[PDB]
Write an enzyme that holds these catalytic residues in place. Structure first.
Site, mmCIF file in Angstrom:
data_model
loop_
_atom_site.group_PDB
_atom_site.id
_atom_site.type_symbol
_atom_site.label_atom_id
_atom_site.label_comp_id
_atom_site.label_asym_id
_atom_site.label_seq_id
_atom_site.Cartn_x
_atom_site.Cartn_y
_atom_site.Cartn_z
ATOM 1 N N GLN A 7 0.338 4.731 12.633
ATOM 2 C CA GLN A 7 0.261 5.572 11.463
ATOM 3 C C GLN A 7 1.564 6.292 11.169
ATOM 4 O O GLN A 7 2.014 7.121 11.946
ATOM 5 C CB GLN A 7 -0.851 6.583 11.671
ATOM 6 C CG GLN A 7 -1.046 7.524 10.532
ATOM 7 C CD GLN A 7 -2.049 8.590 10.875
ATOM 8 O OE1 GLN A 7 -2.122 9.619 10.200
ATOM 9 N NE2 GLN A 7 -2.832 8.356 11.935
ATOM 10 N N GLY A 8 2.149 5.977 10.025
ATOM 11 C CA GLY A 8 3.396 6.591 9.631
ATOM 12 C C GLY A 8 4.446 5.517 9.463
ATOM 13 O O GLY A 8 5.349 5.599 8.626
ATOM 14 N N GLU A 23 19.022 8.751 8.251
ATOM 15 C CA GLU A 23 18.403 9.926 8.871
ATOM 16 C C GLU A 23 18.165 9.758 10.371
ATOM 17 O O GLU A 23 18.060 8.637 10.881
ATOM 18 C CB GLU A 23 17.040 10.246 8.212
ATOM 19 C CG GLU A 23 17.087 10.991 6.879
ATOM 20 C CD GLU A 23 16.838 12.495 6.997
ATOM 21 O OE1 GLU A 23 17.009 13.088 8.092
ATOM 22 O OE2 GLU A 23 16.482 13.094 5.960
ATOM 23 N N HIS A 62 0.781 -1.225 0.000
ATOM 24 C CA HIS A 62 0.000 0.000 0.000
ATOM 25 C C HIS A 62 0.817 1.281 0.000
ATOM 26 O O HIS A 62 0.293 2.355 -0.293
ATOM 27 C CB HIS A 62 -0.990 0.013 1.166
ATOM 28 C CG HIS A 62 -0.363 -0.169 2.510
ATOM 29 N ND1 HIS A 62 0.402 -1.268 2.834
ATOM 30 C CD2 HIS A 62 -0.430 0.586 3.632
ATOM 31 C CE1 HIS A 62 0.774 -1.183 4.100
ATOM 32 N NE2 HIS A 62 0.282 -0.068 4.606
ATOM 33 N N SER A 108 3.997 2.417 8.403
ATOM 34 C CA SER A 108 3.797 1.489 7.280
ATOM 35 C C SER A 108 5.005 1.288 6.379
ATOM 36 O O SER A 108 5.607 2.250 5.871
ATOM 37 C CB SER A 108 2.626 1.926 6.418
ATOM 38 O OG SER A 108 1.420 1.511 6.992
ATOM 39 N N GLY A 109 5.348 0.022 6.174
ATOM 40 C CA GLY A 109 6.476 -0.301 5.322
ATOM 41 C C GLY A 109 7.748 -0.327 6.127
ATOM 42 O O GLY A 109 8.849 -0.230 5.583
ATOM 43 N N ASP A 131 1.027 -7.829 1.291
ATOM 44 C CA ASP A 131 1.491 -6.455 1.447
ATOM 45 C C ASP A 131 2.997 -6.235 1.275
ATOM 46 O O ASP A 131 3.732 -6.221 2.253
ATOM 47 C CB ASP A 131 1.059 -5.952 2.827
ATOM 48 C CG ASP A 131 0.986 -4.441 2.912
ATOM 49 O OD1 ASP A 131 0.657 -3.953 4.005
ATOM 50 O OD2 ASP A 131 1.244 -3.740 1.909
ATOM 51 N N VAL A 133 14.939 17.771 9.139
ATOM 52 C CA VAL A 133 16.162 18.546 9.212
ATOM 53 C C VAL A 133 17.313 17.765 8.558
ATOM 54 O O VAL A 133 17.416 16.523 8.672
ATOM 55 C CB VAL A 133 16.449 18.895 10.703
ATOM 56 C CG1 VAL A 133 17.935 18.915 11.007
ATOM 57 C CG2 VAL A 133 15.837 20.208 11.010
ATOM 58 N N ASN A 150 16.735 13.151 12.348
ATOM 59 C CA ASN A 150 15.602 14.053 12.288
ATOM 60 C C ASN A 150 15.236 14.127 10.824
ATOM 61 O O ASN A 150 16.056 14.557 9.989
ATOM 62 C CB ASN A 150 15.948 15.455 12.733
ATOM 63 C CG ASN A 150 14.761 16.384 12.618
ATOM 64 O OD1 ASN A 150 14.033 16.350 11.625
ATOM 65 N ND2 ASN A 150 14.552 17.212 13.627
ATOM 66 N N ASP A 191 2.721 -0.299 20.370
ATOM 67 C CA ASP A 191 2.529 -0.880 19.058
ATOM 68 C C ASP A 191 3.076 0.020 17.951
ATOM 69 O O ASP A 191 3.629 1.083 18.230
ATOM 70 C CB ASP A 191 1.039 -1.101 18.863
ATOM 71 C CG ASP A 191 0.728 -1.789 17.582
ATOM 72 O OD1 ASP A 191 1.559 -2.632 17.165
ATOM 73 O OD2 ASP A 191 -0.346 -1.501 17.004
ATOM 74 N N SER A 192 2.944 -0.415 16.700
ATOM 75 C CA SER A 192 3.385 0.378 15.558
ATOM 76 C C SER A 192 2.186 1.226 15.139
ATOM 77 O O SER A 192 1.043 0.837 15.334
ATOM 78 C CB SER A 192 3.821 -0.533 14.416
ATOM 79 O OG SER A 192 2.823 -1.486 14.106
ATOM 80 N N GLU A 208 22.791 12.192 5.502
ATOM 81 C CA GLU A 208 21.668 11.664 4.747
ATOM 82 C C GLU A 208 22.036 11.512 3.275
ATOM 83 O O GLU A 208 22.973 12.149 2.781
ATOM 84 C CB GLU A 208 20.466 12.611 4.844
ATOM 85 C CG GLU A 208 19.898 12.808 6.225
ATOM 86 C CD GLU A 208 19.875 14.269 6.659
ATOM 87 O OE1 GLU A 208 18.927 14.666 7.388
ATOM 88 O OE2 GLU A 208 20.812 15.010 6.288
#
Lengths: 223, 110
Positions: A174-175, A52, A40, A177-178, A84, A57, A54, A171-172, A62
């Site tokens: 929103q954000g 990375e 997804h 994912s993957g 998935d 920033v 931050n 838990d894991s 990076e």
């Protein structure tokens, strides 16, 4: 990630940020010019960020590398989420220092009870919102394919596998994912889904990376 | 991206965890042009705002503390002056809206 702790400027060298203006997804570098992520999480115009701390920033440690090509997975189906996974190729291939390193593919799906390391830049407030600048970390055991189903009636499959704490609060989210769900040098899981975040009898759900072992060899051999 | 619909009431949220959320729209509908595939419009919008409602709610719009009833079919029921769909507005002991209507509450205010 809800319930976790700060990892530490590169401690999860294989962790990446899938970006396209803003950070929307995880990603664990499996090697030189490639990245493993979620189904997804697919989009048109990925810019992968490696090494990375931050995300909002720049810290000259990076590497911004666009996405040469972004594959997906056959059976992948949006409704049940079963299957998935996405595969990303880097227009190039980074340097691979201490900070930016590669994780390693599994050999055999880890058993339950196993403490795994889940990480991302997602939300740290279950009921609410508090997206962090620095990468967060979470230690979590695998639940029995038995219990997984016990919470998500007729929704799990030969790939997705719960992980987390049945009592919740950690838990894991929103954000994330993957994201990577490592367990002793092995990239066993991929942040996939879950009802809400960290809520009793509603653990998370990450896809079994071990069942796509071949799939990858191929997909990288070609493409 | 491009929100595949102007308004939507029955707004479902995927269990998935990207940022922003990825949502789907149910709505009864008529095969007008019915998006990029239809059964409802099976097109997933990925964005902060899943769209406004098609028909307002007593709560007026936003509500930070909106009680609820996940199951079927209560689906919840949450300032200053109330809103056009409200129906029992009233101040209280402190300074000088509760509605029977159901349906999936929209977002919060703060």
């Amino acid at each position: 990630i809800v319930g976790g702790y700060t990892c530490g400027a590169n401690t999860v060298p294989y962790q990446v940020s899938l970006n396209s203006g803003y950070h929307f997804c995880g990603g664990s570098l499996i090697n030189s010019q490639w990245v493993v992520s979620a189904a997804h999480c697919y989009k048109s115009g990925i810019q992968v960020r490696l090494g990375e701390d931050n995300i909002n920033v720049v810290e000259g440690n990076e590497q911004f590398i666009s996405a040469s090509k972004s594959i997906v997975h056959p059976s992948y189906n949006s409704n049940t989420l079963n299957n998935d996974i996405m595969l990303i190729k880097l227009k190039s291939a980074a340097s691979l220092n201490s900070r930016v390193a590669s994780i390693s593919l599994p050999t055999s799906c880890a058993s339950a009870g196993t403490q795994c390391l889940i990480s991302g830049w997602g939300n740290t407030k279950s009921s609410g919102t508090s997206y962090p600048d620095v990468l967060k970390c979470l230690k979590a055991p695998i639940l029995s394919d038995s219990s997984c189903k016990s919470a998500y009636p007729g929704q799990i499959t030969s790939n997705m596998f719960c992980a987390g704490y049945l009592e919740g609060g950690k838990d894991s989210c929103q954000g994330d994912s993957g994201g990577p769900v490592v367990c002793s040098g092995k990239l066993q899981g991929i942040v996939s889904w879950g009802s809400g975040c960290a809520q009793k009898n509603k653990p998370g759900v990450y896809t079994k990376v071990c069942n796509y072992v071949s799939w990858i060899k191929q997909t990288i051999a070609s493409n | 991206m491009e929100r595949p619909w102007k308004c939507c009431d029955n707004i479902k949220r995927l269990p998935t965890k990207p940022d922003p959320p990825q949502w789907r729209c149910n709505d009864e509908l008529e095969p007008s042009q019915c998006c990029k595939s239809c059964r409802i419009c099976e097109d997933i919008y990925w964005g902060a705002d899943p769209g406004p409602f098609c028909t307002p709610r007593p709560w007026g719009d936003c509500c930070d503390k909106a009680f609820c009833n996940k199951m079927n079919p209560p689906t919840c029921r949450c300032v200053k002056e109330c809103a056009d769909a409200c129906k029992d507005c009233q101040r209280v002991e402190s300074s000088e809206c509760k509605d029977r209507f159901t349906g999936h509450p929209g977002p919060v205010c703060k």
